[PDB]
Structure formats: structure tokens, C-alpha cells
Subunit: 196 residues, 4 copies
């Protein structure tokens, strides 16, 4: 068995680094199944040359809406669950990570099917916050996915490989996705059908 | 569809800024209906020239009270729910936002009707905390709403408009409200009546 | 009605201050009734000359124990609830505050009566953490209450008075308590008796 | 009764210190019973010469996995519960502490028995984060336990002793464990058997 983190605390990735290069999110988001749950997933990169600490991820849905009483809220914000309640949103960023939002009854995507997706006027805003270990100061890295950048029925190509003791990252596959068989039904639609 | 946040992470608001001007809360708070729930809402402004990070909102009710056992607590503090349990209190402050507190069984306003409002000896304290991106240091901006500054049955005038690619903010409508048809019953009173 | 916090955000306390003096906890803790619940309460002071921010309170019980399997844990730590789950532990420290821990089924004090109190080998550790606004750096102020410093059946003397527009603090009554009629039964004992 | 923390807030440990030495985790993790619950425990050390503040502990499970749909996640991360939901993960680090993760239905170890342990391809990553009081800047200390470093049926040797007023720490027993009678059944297996 090959360790990922040594006793003293130094990680075994990118042999021989120094632990202003910006942080990367995948260009695209995907939606596909994971242990019978529908998920929306994007990948968030690591800082090659340094650690990021009190590191955490969140996501906002920018979508205009009208309240039943008539009130039009242009570009309304509502939080997307990506680990808040369990702490999985507090990241150990030592290699590019797939962040996953389980689309459930409380998810803004509960009712959206594949065909219904590209009709939606919406935008996901991904926000990474953390303190850069060397530097000392707090960072914040943002990116955005509009509808036409969310791919239904795809998965992320694994970037991780282990050769000669260390773990190395194929960075040319970072934004790479691939197609996987996936229902076109909405999350709600899938639970309705299951519950009978 | 016109993006609000670009891939690289720069927002498309106030074309051509530099991303000591203080932050603004609306002068007034309002109470009115939103998807069948009664809400107390105030607006909190953005920092024209910079980002605010680990950005978060909370609110305190200053109200003296007497415990059933006889104990008089002058100017007692109790938290007002404005997103704590879901993370909606963690703000993405890229344009003036309406903060909303759903008046429910746990809300200090559960039992207060329109007529009953102006009799109450109470004060809401709104507190924004965040680290200013450029600067590096933590900010804290406070403001206050007493009874006579909470308007029953109003809504906030939308400040947001999109012209020529960017989103621009009509700041002269920031504190602007308008009247909307709203029940004068208290939140509790409204749920009692509904549940039959 | 006399405001405690003005629109611009400056508080109306201690007329004419500058908003190394250390922070004070009350020397003593008390236990007494509040709206039919038994509570353990201590008072935590304010920083005369400055604000404290991301301000928060927690409390630890230092008490040795033996696990049913035989394991002796000298000076074991277990968290005391003083607002965690609702945010009431996030403080707006603009005047000396009574912190309150509702003694319930999950409280380490559930089973302790008045007579049973002074037999207990225990210690409460109160810890205030916050960033000092002027300074910029994080503070931490600790204090401790052993058994013989927790007074059963007392309350805190209110320090707060309003004269000539501003609110002024009688600091000679900070640590002052007074006796109030209170059951000598334990919290559990009180709920058992009530539930019949 | 001998205090651990004095009124003014100075702790009574290591008589006569100054309150770059790194922080230590125990080399080994253990699994054994605590009040009828199965627990995974590691010990985390203190900073001899200084306080650590906003101090907190978390733990990550690095374990590759395959989703029922076929997706292989190399070196997948999932949070281990070590106090998140109650605040017991927010540490008062004034002497070496045993961190405890109660192995329950939500714990990744629910299904793992003694014999089944050494077959598992897994790694626990322990991460302490805190601000160093003197310094001002944020620390982060990591360590790791692979399978062969988790000892089933052991406990930690207590390091704490009180002599001449102060509490002193036998640091040569920090990583010391000892055997204790413990079931070889998995956590799930133990609950199945109990529930009949
Ligand atoms: Pr290679
Ligand atoms: Pr490829
Ligand atoms: Pr214009
Ligand atoms: Pr207008
Ligand atoms: Pr922080
Ligand atoms: Pr006077
Ligand atoms: Pr007096
Ligand atoms: Pr000695
Ligand atoms: Pr020994």
C-alpha cells in the first residue's frame, strides 16, 4: 500500500515541488448517477506550489424568480448543497477534487430533466475560499457554469495515477469528461418511478 | 443568456471599477409575503471598489424581557434566523442583496401582527462580517432597525438592470420600497387560520 | 424609545470612548430558573476601548471519568451547550452579557442537584475568542469555574442603566449576584416530577 | 481540588514555560470500546511553548472506491466524524488529547471487523488547524494512519499526572498504547447481535 500523506504530514504528490499561479475549476459541470443518486459535479483544482488551509467550497445558484405573490427577484441567490451539513465542503486540497452535489428534494435541480435542462435560465457560481499557507493571507477563487456548460450524463476522467512511489496528476485530463449511460428523467421523476 | 460571473471569476457588474467607502444597509426593513411565508427583509449593500470574503450576515434582536420566574433582562439579545442552518447567511456580495428572515414558530415575530407591531419595544441589529480582499483585514459593518423603521406590507424596489453586456445598479432605489397587498394578521394568526 | 445601535453602526454605550485592558468573566457562575428551564449562567464582559469581531463563546467541562469498560480518562473534556446550534454563541459584545446554558438531557448537569453539586469533582472552562477590530489580530480570553464557584439558586444583578441618551454600565455590580427562590432538585429530577 | 485553568486564564500545566517545535499526533490509532460504543481514537499533542486558537480537528478517509454505476474514484475523500455536530472538534489544547470517533451507522468503519481490518486498502488523514497565539498566523498540522497503523483492541496510556500543584505530562507515554479486551466483531455486527 502506497501512502498519500506521510507521518510528518508531507503529501506524496508531484515529486519535488516547493510545498502567481491561479486555481482552476473545470470548465464544465456534469450530471450523472452515483450510487443511485443523481449528482451535479464540477472539479476544483489544487495550488501546485502551496497549501490552502481552512479550505472550503460553496456554490450559489443565480436564477431570477417570481414569488407566488407576484414579486420578481432578478438574479436570486440560493445555496447549493456541496457538503455543508457533514463537513465534506471543508476540503483537503492535495489533488484535484470532484465536488458533488446530490440532487435531492432540497436541491434546485430536483425537478429538472435532461430535455428541461437547456430551457432553464440559470447559473451556478462556484466559490473556493481558503488561506494560502506560505502567504498567510486569505484567497478567494470564483468560477461559473451556465446552462450550456452543464453536461447531462457525463463523468469526469480520473486525473490520478501512481508511478514510482509518488502520485502524479495528468493535468491535460482535468477538464476532460466522457459519456456514461444515464437516465434523462429528472431527479424527482426518478424517485416517483422508483416509489412503486 | 448574459453571465453574471465569468469563467475566470470576474463579475459582470459596474463596468470598469477597481476589483474609505463604507457599506450600506437599507434604512428600512419590510415585512411582506414570499411564497406564502411572512418575511422580514432588509437590504445590504456591496463594496463598490472591492470584494468581501468569508462574507456573512447575522441579526440580533435587542428586546428587554421578563422571565416567568420574575427576572428582568434589560436589552436581551436573541439571534434572528437569516440563513444560518442552510448557509444562505454566507453571502456572495456582488450586488445589493435582500436578506430575508422567514417569520416562523421560532422567529421572535411569530406572534406580532400589523397593529401589534408599533406597540413593541424592540430593535433589530444587523451585522455584516467579512474580510476585505484587497486590504487583507477583517471588516464589521453594523446597522439598526427600531420598530418605527420596520414597514409592514412593503417590498424592496429591484435595483438590478442589465444594459450593454454588464449589470448596472440603480443606487437611488436602494432604500426604496413600495406597498404590496399583505395580511395584517400575525404569522401565528395566519397559520392558525390556514390549518382549518 | 432609546436606540442601542445607531443607523451608521456606532453603539450608544459609555459616552465618549475610543471605539492593554484585558476582558473579564464574572468570578462566579450561577444556576437558577429561566422560563421553567434550569440554567447555568456566567457573565462575560466587554472591551471598553474596542470592538471584538467574529466574536464567539464556548465552554468546556474538565471532569475525570471512567468508561463502563474500565478506562480512566483523567480531566476529560466535553463541550457545554451555550448557543452552538442556533448561533447564540456568536456574540454581539457591546455590553456585559449573561451567557446561559440550558441544563437539559444532553447537559453534563442533567443529573446534578443542589446537594449533589458540592460533591462533584468538576471544572467549567469558559473561552471567548474574537478578532480585536482596531488591532486586527485574534484574541482568546479564558477563565474557570470550579464547583465551589458555582452558586445554586442565584441570579446576576443587572448592570445596565439608561441615563441622558446613552447606556451606562454599573461595573461594580458586574460580579454581583443575588439569591432567588429555586428548587434544590436536579434538572432530571424536575422533569421526572413534572411528567406526571 | 486542583484547578487546571486559573481565574485569570493561565493553565496549570508544565510549570514555568513561555505561554520551531512542530505538533505531534500519535504514531498509532486504536479501536476499542467506550461506554458500549466502538471507537477509533488517535492522540493529538500540544504546543509546548504557545497557545493554539480557533483550534479544531478534522479527519479524512482516503479510500478508492467504485460507484454501483461503475465509476472508479481513486483515493476518494469522505469526512470522519470527530465532533463536528456538537463542537467537540473545536479543541481546548492545553494537554495532549485523545480524539475519538464513534463508529456508527454513518462511520466508514461501521462494517469493518478485526479480521476484516487488515484487508482494507484505506488511509485516515488527521488535520489540525489553528492560529498560533504569539505568532498571529494560521498553522496546519497533518498526519496519517494507514491500515497497519490502526491497532484493534487497544487503548491510550494516560500521559497526565498531578504533582506539586501543577499538572505534568509524561511525554514518553504519548504514543504508548496497551491491550484491552475488545470484541473482534464489527460495529454493525455488534449492534445486530445486541438488537435481539
Ligand atoms: Pr511520469
Ligand atoms: Pr485523455
Ligand atoms: Pr446606463
Ligand atoms: Pr424610483
Ligand atoms: Pr475564520
Ligand atoms: Pr451617571
Ligand atoms: Pr449593588
Ligand atoms: Pr516530576
Ligand atoms: Pr510506560
Amino acid at each position: 500500500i502506497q501512502r498519500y500523506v506521510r507521518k510528518d504530514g508531507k503529501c506524496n504528490v508531484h515529486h519535488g515541488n516547493v510545498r502567481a499561479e491561479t486555481l482552476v475549476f473545470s470548465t464544465h459541470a456534469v450530471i450523472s448517477m452515483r450510487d443511485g443518486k443523481l449528482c451535479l459535479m464540477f472539479r476544483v483544482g489544487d495550488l501546485r506550489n502551496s497549501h490552502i488551509v481552512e479550505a472550503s467550497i460553496r456554490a450559489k445558484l443565480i436564477k431570477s424568480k417570481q414569488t407566488s405573490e407576484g414579486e420578481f427577484i432578478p438574479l436570486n441567490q440560493t445555496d447549493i448543497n456541496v457538503g455543508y451539513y457533514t463537513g465534506d465542503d471543508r476540503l483537503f486540497l492535495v489533488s484535484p477534487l470532484i465536488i458533488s452535489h446530490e440532487i435531492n428534494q432540497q436541491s434546485p435541480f430536483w425537478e429538472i430533466s435532461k430535455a428541461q435542462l437547456p430551457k432553464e435560465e440559470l447559473e451556478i457560481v462556484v466559490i473556493l475560499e481558503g488561506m494560502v499557507e506560505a502567504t498567510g493571507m486569505t484567497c478567494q477563487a470564483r468560477s461559473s457554469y451556465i446552462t450550456s456548460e452543464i453536461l447531462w450524463g457525463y463523468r469526469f476522467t480520473p486525473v490520478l495515477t501512481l508511478e514510482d512511489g509518488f502520485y502524479e496528476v495528468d493535468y491535460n485530463s482535468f477538464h476532460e469528461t466522457y459519456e456514461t449511460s444515464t437516465p434523462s428523467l429528472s431527479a424527482k421523476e426518478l424517485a416517483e418511478l422508483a416509489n412503486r
